[PDB]
Structure 1
Amino acid sequence: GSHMEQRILKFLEELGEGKATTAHDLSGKLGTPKKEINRVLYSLAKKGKLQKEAGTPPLWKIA
């Protein structure tokens, strides 16, 4: 799918098996604003491709 989803999918995959990160972390390490990051994460989520542990902030890993 997308460039941005590409990059996000790279980073999460490389963290490890079950390692999870935040939109904030991603935002910093990819140089994109959090708004974009979240936009995509929530998409990939609705797409079954990722998993959100809900809280403050939510945690994102692969399902």
Structure 2
Amino acid sequence: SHMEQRILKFLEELGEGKATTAHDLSGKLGTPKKEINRVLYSLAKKGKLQKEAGTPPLWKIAVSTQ
């Protein structure tokens, strides 16, 4: 499952403290938004990503938790 590696790679190259939407990830990475959101919610559960509230939700690399 190298879909996790490319998303974390994309959020790293986006910049410091930068966030983006799941619809934007589906467009750039060329991956259906269905698989994207399934991985995004999974990476936030692993603690590697954090979800900013909003519609749609914004996603960035987690900074706070251990």
- Decide: shared fold, TM above 0.5: yes
Superposition deviation, residue 19 in structure 1:
0.5
Which runs of at least 4 in structure 1 moved beyond 6 Å after TM superposition?
none
Q: Distance in 1 between matches of 2:48 and 2:11?
A: 12
Higher share in helix: 1
- For residues 13-28 of structure 1, what are the structure 2 equivalents within 5 Å? 13-28=12-27
2:63 pairs with 1:51? no
With structure 1 as the length reference, what TM-score do the two structures score?
A: 0.94
Unaligned runs of 5+ in 2: none
Please identify the structure whose Cα radius of gyration is greater.
Answer: 2
With structure 2 as the length reference, what TM-score do the two structures score?
A: 0.90
Q: How many residue pairs get matched?
A: 62
Deviation by residue 1:9-39 (Cα, 9 ceiling, x = unmatched): 1100001110101100000001111111000
Q: Percent identity over the alignment?
A: 100
Q: Distance in 1 between matches of 2:2 and 2:38?
A: 14
